[model samples]
Target: SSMSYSWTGALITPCSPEEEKLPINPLSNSLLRYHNKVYCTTSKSASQRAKKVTFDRTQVLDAHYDSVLKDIKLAASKVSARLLTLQQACQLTPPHSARSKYGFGAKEVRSLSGRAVNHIKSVWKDLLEDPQTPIPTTIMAKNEVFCVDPAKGGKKPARLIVYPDLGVRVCEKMALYDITQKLPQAVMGASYGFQYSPAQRVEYLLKAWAEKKDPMGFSYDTRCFDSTVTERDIRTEESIYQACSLPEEARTAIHSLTERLYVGGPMFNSKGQTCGYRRCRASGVLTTSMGNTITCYVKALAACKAAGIVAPTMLVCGDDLVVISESQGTEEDERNLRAFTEAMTRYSAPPGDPPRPEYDLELITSCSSNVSVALGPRGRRRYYLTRDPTTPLARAAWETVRHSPINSWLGNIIQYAPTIWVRMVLMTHFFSILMVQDTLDQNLGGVNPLDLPAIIERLHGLDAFSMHTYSHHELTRVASALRKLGAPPLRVWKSRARAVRASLISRGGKAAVCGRYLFNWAVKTKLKLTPLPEARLL
Candidate 1:
């Protein structure tokens, strides 16, 4: 009897929107004012207030030191993991059964029975023992095979049958019980099943097997006897065989296999005739006799998909499962997939998703005119340590100095003491000075010098002249001017110009405009400088 069931279909969900399109927090009025005046302005004077003059040079140097250390550690870890995975793959061995069964010089079994026996005994022994090995169960099942025939009254009165096996069984039994005397030679070799006995003898045996007489006792040929057996008889025989031979797992596997084989299988044709191969070549991996690549591709896709987070798109072509996403992907994405595939292919584990760093800067404070004296004219000169809200590090340092009056005093002395001849005092004693101690106490985070330009623009608005040369250069020049106020010899200024010329020439004559701009911008915006305004600023 045929069985039927209603399908409870699932609803398809729509894709979610991208993150960037989501709503953001509303800006406060003060923040909006600051953003518009500082970040959105295009005046020259506004650029001046935005510049950074004094920096926590020690903090920057420490960050550099830490970055280098971290990079070295990361590189070492990556290399070590790669080496371990390679060693593991090299040490592993191929499956023994696959090597033995699929080895060279194995005789090809043609009949379904023979093929099933060989596949079950040899090809699938490992899978039967350990079901997790990923071998197909139906290929392992040595059971009766059934296929539905559409031409026999379509689904209204469904027809399903087992061929070859049952037909031959019934014929053989009938031949043995033939009451009317017939050729003894025919009955001797006759078998119900399509058993190949040395080729030449089987044809004669088949003819004898089909020669059955009706109740009237007139003998009919094999073809005529076969015509008398209705489709129902075949179905009934198939059901009996299925009941007897099928294991629970095998039955389920067979039903699934049959459904797949009928509609999307490598063989069955839509037209019902055993037509030529139709499975798309581009869609799958393995090339079967019927040209069905879809199954192989599906198998490969399943394997890849089973890898979970590490799984990439599996593109199959002619028995080969090429991991398309992993093979041809961007450097970063590929690195992730490679790590994942390695874990999956070798360790059979899912790869971990590492935390990605978010590149951003936090404003620390508004620009101030607090000054620190560095080496200059006679003794030392006063230079402003302006509050630069652009840099988190600078702000933190300032806060630290503000909170720790002793440290701030020490920092001021150290900064001014560069003019003193006590070289050891500046290098050793002053190095420990905690400049901007109060700012540091505020819990402000560090900032990258690379992000200084954007920070500066965000804090002080775009000023053409101020953007050209930052406060640092201006302060340096002011100090130089103060030192040589008394009409200093032309040689001194000429020598300075000469030095600048020599430096530019040494740097390949500034052929790269972008490189020059970056260097200038880094010093002006990030380092917090009041540079000399010039036409070359642009």
Candidate 2:
């Protein structure tokens, strides 16, 4: 196989409009009109991010970085049973995984386990034998939503993810899955946001909002985060294994993988054309997500220490971060934040802007979420986390033969349930669409947000869906979460719900009843009152 090359990190820029390819999807033009500027996909200013690094990538194996690494290994090794034998790992590989380009589907590969094992075994040999050799990855595209995109000419052709072959993917897990599963949270304590469940995240948001006295929230975003991971960063990651005193074979495997595959790989597009080199953490790789968190946390915590902030509360997932700090007052806090920003900037990662302070937690936005409020059943205030759920021509494309999932609807519903999206647009659309499409029993590609009626039954209870009452505590927290988080008023929510109901009724009987029951808040009807989960019928 031939290899290809390209600069990555902040060195790469979005494809210019001059390089446009067509029959452009509506998404491209929609985004351009969105900002009234030519659309650029994600990784905007990737070139800027690349130019800012001061420390040698390998220089990160210093004291603090090593400590983070040691803790990760320490946590990882304690959960040892997961490091399965080659065959043990192979049998566990799900048949649904992406099939190999080398003519092996996950099914036959798993069924004829000998062939699968040998395929990976051979790859591992080359990896250990030659660390400097380049690895090639199949580049697959996905339609995902986010803040700023800079992929294909700002087109809607899906996010391009470059990762190694499936043989390498499973092999990656055989060696490192245990580490990825347990290490990141252990290594990045208080900052590993993924460890927190949705309810916990909501509680954390509400709790933060309630403690308004401390009141300074700042969010930091790393531009082209995965793309900026240099070879040195990859090396620094491997050093953690050494620090952890991993078994020599395990350590060598990781080191070999770091040099051979993790750091950089050649990416091939659909037409089998050599695209370019991916010099960052490519998605669809094992441990890439965990590796990203560990590295980001290393920079962020180090920045906090250098800036003299006393253990700021942080919630980190990948390059997105929210830090809530005890305020030393406005102007002084801004100075402190700027100093913190400088520390991170010097550390080879920088914030999009100087940190801004807010007196209220609801004003704090991290991971695109801010606090929103609404009212619940008993006149209790509900507060929940919410974010901008806009996608390019989202509703416009919703009915089309679009690919992948609608990314943020469930987040909107779970975070702020009683809001207009959940009550009106989401619920009405769910039953309306499901009833119209009759997709309830169909195979789901992924869980759709509109499956609340179905999901409610699976988790809580079917009757629980239409049962009007919520527990005192449950109702209070939800209302408070929404209220504190600043969801639109309850009346507006009910009004919106009623509008959906009216439309459903116009469509007639079942649809109208479905609207009334599913979105009961708008119907102004009294149902049997009981606690939510406890009263749920089996």
Best by TM-score: 2
Which lDDT values do the candidates have, in the order given? 0.23, 0.56
Candidate 1 — which residues are off by over 4 angstroms?
Answer: 1-215, 219-238, 253-538
Evaluated against the true structure, the overall lDDT of model 1 is 0.23
Q: Which tens-of-lDDT digit does each residue in 457-509 have in candidate 1? A: 34322231022222453345433332322212223333333333333334452
TM-scores, in order shown?
0.14, 0.73
lDDT, candidate 2, at 358: 69
RMSD of 2: 7.7
lDDT for residue 214 in candidate 2, whole number 0-100: 65
